[PDB]
Structure formats: structure tokens, C-alpha cells
């Protein structure tokens, strides 16, 4: 009966919007849906055996003119190997490095802030690693609906082949990839518009076999609360 609980139904496939940046320049954007998640790879000839939809980062020669940057980006892509795998399991987003390119992740804004912040951690190689929990996200989302100020962050940013930009802008980095589960973007936006001049608003979760929902502010909050109770916490 709770239409938001479709998000956690076994077999459901979230849409992941993947945006790649070469030195602060957008060079790639694609939305994928896959049960085994995705894998950010460096070439078309990778390794089919590894599960997950292969997301091939483009050759810098198609977008860049800096020969020095092109060479360094090409070396990063060629060392990606198996690549960076991102998949979903329940209320968690998991990440694992399958190549030799150290990758550092962080949950941040839709656009990486001019100021900076730092990494939330390094993507592990020899084992799995959680990079996002839907649990605390909805809890913050509910708190946000209650007008407590700050919307929850949902944009996963990955720094590939280099350490995280702490003492330098993110635009200096060779390969920066943003991955946004479009359902989270939709949820936040629905919360944002929820407290405005309209009885009902439309939210589209952009997940498999989902229809656009038209809810009032209070029943959207109610659905959020019920979704929370059904989720796991320590």
C-alpha cells in the first residue's frame, strides 16, 4: 500500500545517472538500470564475466585539447582494468575497486562546492564497501520536510586515479565521476516543493515498473515515516 516501499522491493532496479568529468569538463552522461549495478571502465575491451553494466568512460581526445591532460587521462583509463563497481543491495549502495586505480568517494551536492570538504573514504579493493545508506537519508529527508533547514545529500562523487581534492579544486582532478540515483533526486525535490502553494505534487521515483505519484505534503511525510520504520538501523 505504501508506494515508496517499492524502492526496497527485491528485484527492483534503480536508475543511476552517471556523469563523468575530465578536469572539470563534462565529457559523458548516461542513465543505466541493472540488477548487478554498474562498472566504470576505461575501454570497450574490458572483461565480460564481471557482472554489472559496463560504463565506458570516453577517450579524452574527443573532448580535450590539452595534450598533457589527454595523456594523463588516457593512463588513468587504461589502468582502470575491471573498473569501479557500484551496485545496490537493499537500503545500501555498495562500491568495490576491481582495477589498480585507487578511487575515493564522497556524498556531496549535485555540483561539487567551490570551497571543498574532503573524501568520505576510499573504495576498497579486496572486499565490498558501503557508500550510501538509505536509512539516515530518509530520516534527514523527513527532518527537512519539517523545515529544519538542510536537504540530504545524494550525489556520489568518485575521484579516480588520484587522491581526493582537499587542498585544490575538484576541477584540477583528471577523472571525476558523479553517480546520482535519480529516485533520491526525485525524493528531495518532492520534499522541496512539498511546502508550497499546491495541494498535491507529482514525484517520479524513476525505478522499474513505477508510475508517477501525486501526493499531498502530509501523506508524503507519512509515507516517508512508514518507509523509515521498515528499514534497518543498528
Amino acid at each position: 500500500e505504501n508506494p515508496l516501499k517499492r524502492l526496497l522491493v527485491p528485484g527492483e532496479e534503480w536508475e543511476f545517472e552517471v556523469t563523468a568529468f575530465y578536469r572539470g569538463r563534462q565529457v559523458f552522461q548516461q542513465t543505466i538500470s541493472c540488477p548487478e549495478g554498474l562498472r566504470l571502465v576505461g575501454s570497450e575491451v574490458g572483461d565480460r564475466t564481471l557482472p554489472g553494466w559496463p560504463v565506458t568512460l570516453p577517450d579524452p581526445g574527443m573532448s580535450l585539447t590539452d595534450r598533457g591532460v589527454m595523456s594523463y587521462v588516457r593512463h588513468v583509463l587504461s589502468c582502470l582494468g575491471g573498473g569501479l563497481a557500484l551496485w545496490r543491495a537493499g537500503q545500501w549502495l555498495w562500491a568495490q575497486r576491481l582495477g589498480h586505480c585507487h578511487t575515493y568517494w564522497a556524498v556531496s551536492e549535485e555540483l561539487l562546492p567551490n570551497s571543498g570538504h574532503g573524501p568520505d573514504g576510499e573504495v576498497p579493493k579486496d572486499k565490498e564497501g558501503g557508500v550510501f545508506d538509505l536509512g539516515p537519508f530518509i530520516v534527514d529527508l523527513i527532518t527537512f520536510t519539517e523545515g529544519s533547514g538542510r536537504s540530504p545529500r545524494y550525489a556520489l562523487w568518485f575521484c579516480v586515479g588520484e587522491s581526493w581534492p582537499q587542498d585544490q579544486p575538484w576541477t584540477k582532478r583528471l577523472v571525476m565521476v558523479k553517480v546520482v540515483p535519480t529516485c533520491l533526486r526525485a525524493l528531495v525535490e518532492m520534499a522541496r516543493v512539498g511546502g508550497a502553494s499546491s495541494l498535491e505534487n507529482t514525484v517520479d521515483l524513476h525505478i522499474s515498473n513505477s508510475h508517477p505519484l501525486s501526493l499531498t505534503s502530509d501523506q508524503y511525510k507519512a509515507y516517508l515515516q512508514d518507509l523509515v520504520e521498515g528499514m534497518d538501523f543498528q
Binding site: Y72, V76, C79, C101, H102, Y104, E162, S163
Partner: peptide
């Protein structure tokens, strides 16, 4: 160029 300075890439092995 040359070497690739200040990259976070572990040595190759297969």
C-alpha cells in the same frame, strides 16, 4: 610522461 607523478595507481600484476 615519462613516469606518471602523483597518481594513485598500484603496480601492475597478472
Amino acid at each position: 610522461s615519462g613516469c606518471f607523478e602523483d597518481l594513485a595507481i598500484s603496480a601492475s600484476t597478472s
